[PDB]
Design a protein around this ligand. Structure first.
Ligand code: CDL
Ligand code: PC1
Ligand code: PC1
Ligand code: 3PE
Ligand code: 3PE
Ligand code: 3PE
Ligand code: 3PE
Ligand code: LMT
Ligand code: LMT
Ligand code: LMT
Ligand code: LMT
Ligand code: SF4
Lengths: 155, 115, 70, 83, 318, 70, 174
């Protein structure tokens, strides 16, 4: 039965991908400090298989951790496009979510979702390191629910 | 034949892994994705532009010193000679001259990189 | 705790043990239960070639003792 | 001696690596002449038989050449066994 | 049977490399007051499997400016030559018994450098080029001292055969009479494997990812496997050189167990060192080797030519 | 008041100079740094088992908003 | 087929020479020289010269790495030339390959060939020595004799290498 085989292969590729999320070493402002605390010993993101890698070529997740300005927007889009696929975007904190404290400024992008597609929004200013971790585990469960091979089988 | 087989297997295995890597995943190729990486901004100038070598003199000295080890590597075999008086003198003479050559390049500021 | 790093070390240790163990056992299997003959110099290869001729079965690891001298 | 001794204590403070190098290289150059065991190195190297010892035609007047390898005449390695 | 012997060599190597990645992450984690992987499989035992699968179903990228053929060739060279470095290793019997096994390992290590130079150059990007030229500097720094350090040790063993080192060290480890050379050998292997505090060709904090910055997915995994394979192999080489294990011909597995423990501990020390020190500047590495190790190595090469001769302890040729 | 952070002249006596030579040649201060990371390997890690364990908070914590009733 | 191993390596040897003699970018010329160094090592090894074969490979690997560094500094252009990118380079490349292909095809057809000078084509193995069983490597014995017979060779090579360091310092101090 192909349905059974593709279902199990979906679980494997999904499991491999959520178990090995490598965020891009990419942070913008104060939200990036709480992201540092998620890597720090109390939360130890690395224990979930979540490992920062500087090169976009070797990253699976972009965590937009801070305010995105108009001057920075093209560079953020550039390094997101240079991520191979599958790739995911986590929006962290009010600034990245929708502009936040600087929403009405002439120099700020009102939410990073105007520039890139976003999989998870983590609320807070900043979200606590635990809140960000909750967002990463929420991303993992979203990847767990993906049905790439089951949909291909029924195409 | 064993050596040739072992080499062929190693590089065949590596080549197969690269074939899988390119034909297994789902691709989505477009211009911006494959553009060169420079931290989010476009590069200024080609990466093929000349890249000055500040250790150029040590690199040339490496060629001469790299050849000295080819003269010295036979020393374990030369120690099996009955003519040990000559062999020891010549063996020390070669190493000393290498040390003198290093000392000269050192004192004359040849090991310092160009500023 | 630190001893939770051991399971990965044990798995890594087992993998590094296999190549040496396998090579030793494969050598005995392919040389009639003995170490593989080592031929670093022409003399040793000459003796091995003579063993192959003397064996009668084209195997240099098949030894012939006094039973073969009349 | 003071100038050299003062020079020694200076290079120990500044360049101990180069002090060790020259000290080590010096012993390499000197000790082989002062060692009493250096002579055995040639003797051992000479006693290793890489070649077949081709026999001599017994012309009837070489009394110091052994007829048999276990005869008294010829070089001996008793010195080597006690080494 | 020989083809089976080859497979029982490289498949375990790849498995050991995969689980070394877990061990480094755990060892680094606990030295950093955290845990490292402990979710993906019990005690993180499945973490390497997820990473490998992830990378090989990830999209590989060929950069627009890149030289296509060289870009593909370089990672194949890296892994293929990393595996080749293992075939002459006596554990206690080598897969390929060589007369000049040490000279074979020197040559194969020199050839592997071109997998860094060509990957960096073929990428056609500035951070990759900078990383590649750091490898040129690194090789110039350590290669001369490394060969002459080996020579001095081999003047006590008498040959370039790796199995002879087992015989040489039957009574005593070579680290006793050659601990100064062992110290300088150990640092050179760190520079040879591009390991901290000599991780300059990658130099993450400086070059993002250096020579492999443009590599993704499966091609990236090949460079990673090659590096960790070389870390283990270089520490097996060190164990044979300086901590020789006794070989009982009738119980060869006792050698393997003892020799494996020594190789593991030496590999752990690489992880230990990475956790402890800052990184060298790549000109300071060149001056370390040329102005410190090389003077001392030349002097000790002289001493180890004379010492066998003056003590009448020259090793046998055979 | 102030203090100098880096203003000290090393002693130039023979014992001190030989202590510094041993440090240079035998890497003593680098070995000491290895001891510190070793001691950490054998300490209990600070990691908590999220989401089964939670970081501590206080009654003043500012989180998600809510509209209340009498 | 394995009996022709030396001939097959020598064919690749020439192919590498055509690679860098057609003079593409020195990056690729260096690659051609490295291939020839490896197969050249393979050729010398099959005549009993393990040390000579490995040594020449070891020396040229170091040499071409220094050439690689100097290429990126002093012999680069915006569009480095592969063999297919330049008409002169491509013409030399194909001309060399065709000449080699023809010499190989005919020498393996007649088990002999006449390309200016007469070359036998029976397989290089026919000329090998038949009777050896010494407890040593003859090439190793000859090389080791550098230090007991070649005192004069040691002096002139040792001096030349020392003068080489002195000379490059002078030449490069503008
Ligand atoms: C195992 C082999 C691993 C290497 C695999 C190479 C193929 C990789 C696939 C690939 O190239 O991508 C698709 C690529 C096409 O993609 P593309 O971007 O449209 O075109 C790429 C460039 O046009 C052409 O690509 P380029 O810019 O890289 O230039 C092509 C080629 C240039 O090739 C030539 O100009 C003539 C052939 C030269 C090689 C022959 C030997 C040269 C002398 C050395 C002697 C060695 C003999 C072997 O460059 C080389 O010099 C090849 C070096 C191979 C070294 C092999 C080691 C030995 O290749 C093709 O499919 C054709
Ligand atoms: C090559 C084959 C490699 C086999 C990998 C086996 C994966 C094991 C695994 O999924 O872990 C248990 C996982 C663990 O479940 P989990 O990943 O959802 O757990 C979430 C994290 N905790 C438990 C801490 C809250 O079980 C599964 O979820 C089922 C996945 C099936 C994978 C497909 C197998 C085919
Ligand atoms: C250290 C070595 C480790 C190596 C590990 C190797 C991986 C082991 C795990 C294998 C799991 C199965 C692979 C599934 C991943 C496929 C990638 C993917 O997700 O694509 C989604 C796609 C989804 O496609 P789609 O049709 O639904 O839509 C995509 C197109 N757009 C964007 C327009 C919507 O799945 C497929 O297209 C095919 C799935 C096939 C599943 C069977 C795999 C067969 C692979 C053979 C390919 C033929 C080439 C030869 C390659 C070499 C063969 C080994
Ligand atoms: C007698 C004469 C007989 C001649 C027989 C040969 C005839 C050739 C027929 C040509 C058929 C045209 C095929 C076009 C094509 O293959 O391109 C499409 C495809 C790339 O994929 P694409 O369609 O662009 O979009 C999805 C990308 N993920 O595929 C590709 O282009 C990728 C090719 C990869 C290289 C493999 C070769
Ligand atoms: C630019 C792209 C680069 C791509 C890289 C591709 C991989 C290249 C791999 C390196 C090539 C050089 C390999 C040279 C092997 C040398 C190993 C050796 O010296 O031992 C091999 C063996 C000699 O045996 P030995 O112990 O020395 O003495 C005789 C007693 N049996 O003798 C043998 O085992 C037989 C060897 C004959 C065939 C050698 C073929 C080498 C030719 C190059 C390929
Ligand atoms: C301060 C930190 C420095 C950081 C640098 C890293 C250094 C780490 C070095 C790791 C190696 C430590 C020594 C290995 C001990 C392993 C002991 C063992 O498993 O084997 C037992 C062995 C005695 O047996 P054996 O070696 O065969 O006897 C010698 C005769 N050939 O040995 C008996 O004990
Ligand atoms: C009978 C007479 C006998 C004659 C022979 C006598 C010989 C013995 C006496 C000679 C001295 C022996 C010791 C020689 C060891 C090498 C010394 C050396 O080169 O290190 C010094 C080097 C200098 O660098 P620096 O301190 O910055 O300042 C120098 C100023 N130009 O500084 C460095 O190299 C620092 C290295 C930095 C990188 C270190 C990272 C790893 C540190 C942990 C390694 C622990 C050691 C592990 C060894 C394991 C071996 C298996
Ligand atoms: C810039 C130029 C620098 C030139 C440097 C030249 C350094 C030469 C230093 C002297 C080294 C040799 O020193 C010399 O070694 C030989 C052994 O080899 C010793 O020779 C001694 O042992 C050998 C065997 O080993 C016997 O055959 C010999 O009869 C006996 O005298 C000498 O007793 C010693 O005087
Ligand atoms: C036979 C083998 C064993 C013998 C060792 C052979 C190598 C000998 C090398 C001797 C080097 C002597 O000449 C060397 O020249 C430079 C001048 O630029 C001196 O001085 C310079 O270098 C040192 C270190 O780089 C600096 O601390 C110093 O501030 C600087 O002025 C070196 O302190 C001296 O060591
Ligand atoms: C154990 C006995 C053997 C000991 C052999 C030691 C030989 C050391 C050779 C010099 C190595 C030191 O390398 C460098 O040498 C220069 C002199 O050349 C020293 O500098 C020295 O210069 C001159 C003497 O030449 C003095 O007036 C000066 O006061 C002194 O400092 C430096 O302190 C040192 O940086
Ligand atoms: C990437 C480019 C690579 C270029 C490589 C160039 C290789 C050069 C061509 C080498 C081919 C030599 O071809 C070799 O010729 C001899 C001819 O007797 C054959 O040897 C033959 O011996 C006897 C002759 O009676 C036959 O029974 C046997 O079938 C056959 O093997 C070899 O089987 C063949 O392998
Ligand atoms: S959301 Fe808050 S903490 Fe985060 S970058 Fe904006 S202002 Fe700073």
């Amino acid at each position: 039965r192909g349905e059974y085989v593709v279902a199990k292969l979906d679980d494997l590729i999904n499991w491999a991908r959520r178990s090995s999320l490598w965020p891009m070493t990419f942070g913008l402002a104060c939200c990036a400090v709480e992201m540092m605390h998620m890597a720090a010993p109390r939360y130890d993101m690395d224990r979930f298989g979540v490992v920062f890698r500087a090169s976009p070529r070797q990253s699976d997740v972009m965590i937009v951790a801070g305010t995105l300005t108009n001057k920075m927007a093209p560079a953020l889009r550039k390094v997101y496009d240079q991520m191979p696929e599958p790739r995911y975007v986590v929006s962290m904190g009010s600034c990245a979510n929708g502009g936040g404290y600087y929403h009405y400024s002439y120099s700020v992008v009102r939410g990073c979702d105007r520039i890139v597609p976003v999989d998870i929004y983590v609320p807070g200013c900043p979200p606590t390191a635990e809140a960000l971790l909750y967002g990463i585990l929420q991303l993992q469960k979203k990847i767990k629910r993906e049905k790439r091979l089951r949909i291909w089988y029924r195409r | 034949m064993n050596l040739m087989l072992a080499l062929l297997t190693n590089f065949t295995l590596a080549t197969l892994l690269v074939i899988i890597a390119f034909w297994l995943p789902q691709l989505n190729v477009y211009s911006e994705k494959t553009s060169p990486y420079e931290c989010g901004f476009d590069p200024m100038g080609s990466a093929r532009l000349p890249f000055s070598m500040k250790f150029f003199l040590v690199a040339i000295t490496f060629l001469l010193f790299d050849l000295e080890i080819a003269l010295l590597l036979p020393l374990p075999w030369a120690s099996q000679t009955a003519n040990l008086n000559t062999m020891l003198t010549m063996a020390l003479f070669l190493i000393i001259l290498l040390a003198v050559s290093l000392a000269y390049e050192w004192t004359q500021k040849g090991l310092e990189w160009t500023e | 705790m630190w001893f939770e790093v051991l399971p990965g070390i044990a798995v890594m240790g087992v993998c590094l043990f296999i190549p040496g163990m396998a090579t030793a056992r494969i050598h005995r299997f392919s040389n009639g239960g003995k170490e593989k003959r080592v031929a670093h110099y022409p003399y040793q290869w000459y003796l091995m070639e003579r063993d192959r001729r003397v064996s009668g079965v084209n195997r240099s690891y098949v030894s012939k003792g006094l039973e073969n001298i009349d | 001696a003071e100038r050299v001794a003062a020079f020694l204590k200076n290079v120990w403070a500044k360049e101990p690596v180069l002090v060790a190098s020259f000290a080590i290289a010096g012993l390499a150059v000197i000790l082989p002449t002062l060692s009493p065991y250096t002579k055995y190195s040639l003797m051992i190297n000479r006693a290793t038989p890489y070649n077949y010892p081709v026999p001599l035609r017994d012309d009837g007047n070489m009394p110091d050449v052994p007829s048999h390898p276990q005869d008294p005449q010829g070089p001996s390695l008793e010195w080597l066994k006690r080494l | 049977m020989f083809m089976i012997n080859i497979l029982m060599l490289i498949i375990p190597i790849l498995l050991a490399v995969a689980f070394l990645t877990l061990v480094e992450r755990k060892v680094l984690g606990y030295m950093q007051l955290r845990k490292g992987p402990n979710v993906v499989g019990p005690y993180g035992l499945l973490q390497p499997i997820a990473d490998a699968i992830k990378l090989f179903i990830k999209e590989p990228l060929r950069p627009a400016t890149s030289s296509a053929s060289m870009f593909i060739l370089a990672p194949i060279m890296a892994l293929g030559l990393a595996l080749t470095m293992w075939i002459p290793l006596p554990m206690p019997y080598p897969l390929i018994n060589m007369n000049l096994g040490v000279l074979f390992m020197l040559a194969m290590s020199s050839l592997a450098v071109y997998s860094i130079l060509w990957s960096g150059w073929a990428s056609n990007s500035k951070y990759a080029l900078i990383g590649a030229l750091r490898a040129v500097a690194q090789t110039i720094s350590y290669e001369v001292t490394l060969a002459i350090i080996l020579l001095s040790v081999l003047l006590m063993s008498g040959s370039f055969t790796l199995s002879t080192l087992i015989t040489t060290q039957e009574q005593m480890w070579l680290i006793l009479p050659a601990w100064p050379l062992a110290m300088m050998w150990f640092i050179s292997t760190l520079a040879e494997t591009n390991r901290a505090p000599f991780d300059l060709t990658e130099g993450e904090s400086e070059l993002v990812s250096g020579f492999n910055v443009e590599y993704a997915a499966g091609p990236f995994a090949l460079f990673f496997m090659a590096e960790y394979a070389n870390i283990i192999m270089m520490n097996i080489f060190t164990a044979i050189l300086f901590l020789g294990t006794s070989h009982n011909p009738h119980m060869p597995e006792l050698y393997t167990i003892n020799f494996t423990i020594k190789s593991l501990l030496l590999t752990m020390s690489f992880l230990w060192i990475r956790a402890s020190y800052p990184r060298f500047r790549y000109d300071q590495l060149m001056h370390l080797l040329w102005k410190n190790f090389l003077p001392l190595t030349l002097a000790l090469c002289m001493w180890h030519v004379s010492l066998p001769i003056l003590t009448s302890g020259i090793p046998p040729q055979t | 008041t102030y203090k100098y952070v880096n203003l000290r002249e090393p002693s130039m006596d023979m014992k001190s100079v030989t202590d510094r030579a041993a440090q240079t040649l035998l890497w003593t201060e680098l070995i000491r740094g290895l001891g510190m990371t070793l001691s950490y390997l054998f300490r209990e890690p600070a990691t908590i088992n999220y989401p089964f364990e939670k970081g501590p908070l206080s009654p003043r914590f500012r989180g998600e908003h809510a509209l209340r009733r009498y | 087929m394995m009996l022709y191993i030396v001939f097959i390596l020598s064919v690749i040897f020439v192919m590498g020479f055509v690679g860098f003699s057609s003079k593409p970018s020195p990056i690729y010329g260096g690659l051609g020289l490295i291939v020839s160094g490896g197969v050249g090592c393979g050729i010398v090894l099959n005549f009993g010269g393990s040390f000579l074969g490995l040594m020449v490979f070891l020396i040229y690997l170091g040499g071409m790495m220094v050439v690689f560094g100097y290429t990126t500094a002093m012999a680069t252009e915006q569009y480095p030339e592969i063999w297919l990118s330049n008409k002169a380079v491509l013409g030399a490349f194909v001309t060399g390959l065709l000449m080699e292909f023809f010499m190989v095809y005919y020498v393996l057809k007649d088990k002999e060939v006449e390309v200016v000078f007469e070359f036998n084509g029976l397989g290089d193995w026919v000329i090998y020595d038949t009777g050896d069983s010494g407890f040593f490597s003859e090439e190793a014995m000859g090389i080791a004799a550098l230090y007991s017979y070649g005192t004069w060779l040691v002096i002139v090579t040792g001096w030349s290498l020392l003068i080489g360091v002195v000379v490059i310092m002078e030449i490069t101090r503008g």
